[model samples]
Target: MLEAKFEEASLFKRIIDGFKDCVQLVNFQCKEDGIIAQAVDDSRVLLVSLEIGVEAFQEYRCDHPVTLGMDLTSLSKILRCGNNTDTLTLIADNTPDSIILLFEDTKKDRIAEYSLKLMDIDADFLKIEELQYDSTLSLPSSEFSKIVRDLSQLSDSINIMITKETIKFVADGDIGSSSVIIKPFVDMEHPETSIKLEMDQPVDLTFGAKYLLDIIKGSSLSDRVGIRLSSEAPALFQFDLKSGFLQFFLAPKF
Candidate 1:
C-alpha cells in the first residue's frame, strides 16, 4: 500500500501543469528517497525531470518501491478541481490498477475524492549527472517567463548571449526583432528579483521560444529560476520548490 499527504495541493498541481504540456503518460517512481519522474516530450526536443522529496509531504509511507504509471492529462484535470489551500491525500495499492486522490477543505469542512485508472507504461529512467556549464544565470522566475512570452511574439527562436556583465535574450522574425537584457545585481534586502550570473566563459546559444515558454509555465511555484547554458550543449532550466525541484533540458535549435 502507498499513502501520502500534502499540506497544500498547489505544489503537485503546478507539477502536473508543467509536465502535461509535454507528456501525456508519466511514470512516477516512489522510492525510499523520494518520488521521481523523467519524461521526454513527443518531439524529443525537451526532457523534464521532477523530484519531490519525502520530506516535502506532510506524510509519506511506502512498503516497497512502487512505480506508478499515470495519465497526466487526467490527473491535471482532477487536480484543477482542488483549491490551492486544500489538503491532498493520495492512496494506491500494489495491484497497480487504480489510484485515489482526496481533497479536503478544513475551513469549510468539504471533501472530494477522485479515482483514476492506471496505465501500463514502459518508460526508461534517464541517468542524469551534473554538468559543468559555461555560463549560469539566476533570476526571478516571473521575469524569465515574461521574457519568453514577450519575445516569442516576434520569432520562433530566442538567442541567448551571456557575458560577465549582462545576459541578453534576443528574437528576430519577419515583423521585427526584440531583445531583453538583465544585469547582475547585489541586493541584500530583496533578493528575489535580483539577477546573478556565474561565467566560466562567454556563451551564446539559440533555443526555441515555445519550449522555453512551456518549461517556465510553473514559474509561479518558485520565486527564482536558474538557467545553465553552454556553447552547443542542451540548456538546463531549474525551478526550485519548497522541498524539491523541477528541471527541464532542451537541446539547442541549431
Candidate 2:
C-alpha cells in the first residue's frame, strides 16, 4: 500500500514537466524515503534523473516499496487539468492496476478524481558512474536559457567554453556568428542569481541547441542551473529542487 499527498500541486507538476519533454515512459520508485525516477530518452542522447523526498510531501505512507510505471506524456496532461495550488493525493494499493489521483480545491470545496492506468516497465535501475568533471559552472537557469534561446536563432549547435572565472557561448551559422562572455558575479541581495565557476582545467564543448533549450524547461523549478563538463564524458545539467533534484545528461555534439 502507498499514499502520498502533495500540498502544492505545482511542485509535482514541475517534477514531471521536466521529464515529459525528454521521455515518454518512466518508472517512479515509491519507497519510504520518497519517489525516484530515472529514464533515458529514446535517442539515447539524453538521460534524466528525478528524486522527491518524503519531506516534500504533506503526508506520506508506504507499507512496501512500489514501482509506478507511468506514461509521462499522458500523466502530464492529467496534472495540467488541476490548478497549481490544489492539493493532490496519490493512492495505490498492493496488486493495483491503476493509481488514484485526487485533487481538492478549498474555496468551493470542489474536488476531482482520476485513475491513471499503470504499465509494467521492465527497465532496470541504471547506475551512473561517479565522474569528476574538468569544469563546473553555476548560474541562473533563466540566464542560461536566454543564451541558448538567442544562440539557437543562428545555428543548430552552441559551443561552450568554460574557464576559471568566466564561461563563454558561441554560435556560428550562415546568418552570421554570435558570442557571449559571462563573468562571475555576486548579487548580495539575491545570492541565487550569482554566477560562479570552478574548474581544474579549461574545457570546451558543443551541444545541440535544441536539446539545451528543451532541458531548460526546468528553469521554472529552480533558480540555479549547474553545468558540469568533461572532455571525456557528456555534459550534465542539474536543477536543484527545494526538497529534491532533477539531473540531466546530454551527449556532446560531434
Candidate 3:
C-alpha cells in the first residue's frame, strides 16, 4: 500500500491545468526506482514526458515494482473540479492496480473521492532513434512561453533557426511575419542566453505552432526548460523531473 499527501503539489496542479483536450493518453513506465510517463500527440509528431519521484511526496511506500497507465483526459477533468486551497490525499491499492485521489475542501461539506483506472500502455509508443541534437539552449520557461505566444499570433508555424550567436524563432503567415531573436542580452533584469555553436553548422527547422503550444502549456510552471537541436533533426525539449522524467521531442515541419 502507498499513500501520499501534498499541501500544494506543483506537478498535480500542472497536469490538471494543461489537460485541456479529450483523447489524451499517458504511457507510464515503472522501473525499480520510480514511475515515468510520456504524453504523445495524435499525429505522433510530438511527445511530452512526465516523471514522478517517490521521495517527492509526503508519504511513499512500495513493495514490488509496478508500471501503471492512465487516461490523462479523464484524470484532468476530475482534478480540475478540486479547489486549490484544499489539501489532497492520494492512496493506491495494495496491488497498485488502482489509485484514489481525494480532496478536502472544507470542514463538513467537503468534496472528495476519485478512482483512476490504471491499464497497460505500450512501451514503444514513442520512438527515440536516428535523431541528433548537438545545439542546446537553457532559458527561462517564462521567456520561452512568451516568445511562442507572440509568434503564434502571426503564423501557424514557426521556423527555429539556431546559430553561434542566438536561436531565432520566426513565424510567417497571411497576417504577417514575426520573429523573436533570443540572444545574450545583458541589460535586462535577467537576460537569457544560449550556447555557442559547436561546429559552425547552423540548424534551421520549421515547427508547428499549434503542437508546440500544446506541448509547452504544462511547462509554464517551470523556471527553466532546456532546448536541444541539430540540423534537420528532431528538437528536444527537456524539463526537470522529480525523479526520472520524460523529454519532449518534435520532428521539424520542414
Best model number under lDDT: 2
lDDT of 2: 0.88
lDDT of 1 by residue, 125-242 (tens): 7755446989989999989989999999999999999888889999998899999998999787887878999999899889888899898897977889999988867788999876
TM-scores, each model vs. reference: 0.96, 0.96, 0.81
Q: Candidate 1 regions off by >4 Å?
A: none
Residue-by-residue lDDT tens digits, candidate 2, 1-254: 89999997998898898988888899998998989999998888788988888888999897788999999888988998888999999999977778999899887676999999999887867766346888988999999889988999998999999877879999997898899999888989989889888888898889888889889998988988998898877888999876788999888877
Error of 3 at 148 (Å): 0.8
| Backbone clashes, each candidate | 0, 0, 0
lDDT on C-alpha atoms for all candidate structures: 0.87, 0.88, 0.67
Model 3: residue 142 alpha-carbon error in angstroms:
1.4
Clashes of 1: 0
Candidate 1 collision pairs: none
What's the true lDDT of residue 180 in model 2?
Answer: 92
